[PDB]
Sequence to fold (149 residues):
Amino acid sequence: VNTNGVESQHTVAAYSLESLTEAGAEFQGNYALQGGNSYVKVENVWVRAETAATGATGQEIAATTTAAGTITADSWVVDVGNAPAANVSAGQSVANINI
Amino acid sequence: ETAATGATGQEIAATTTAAGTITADSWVVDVGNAPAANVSAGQSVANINI
Fold:
């Protein structure tokens, strides 16, 4: 995702569609609302998203919604935060392997 | 073009600062101004330098 015009790679947790549809979520386009949490379909995997103006960094807009009964009308942005349950990174790169 | 002129949430192109005579704004790619005819090209035939 590009922030302020420069791209970067962020690791964020992913949620399966089956769990979302089992929990009783209301969907709209690429946007979902399971309840107190909101999700956007930026790619084939669903990710929790922040409402708007939280990062205040001009991040790429994940999706836009409308009334749709009980859906807030806002321009949603993928949550750059929301670290996974177990955030583990590779100790060394491929070119710096030391075992 | 400057920010708050597309009014669609378009992807931000670049952000600048003062740096002298440059206005600090979140510039965005100006959708529109399609290639128009009758515009000066690079060089003439007799002065081709590529």
Q: What stands out?
A: The radius of gyration of chain A is 16 Å.
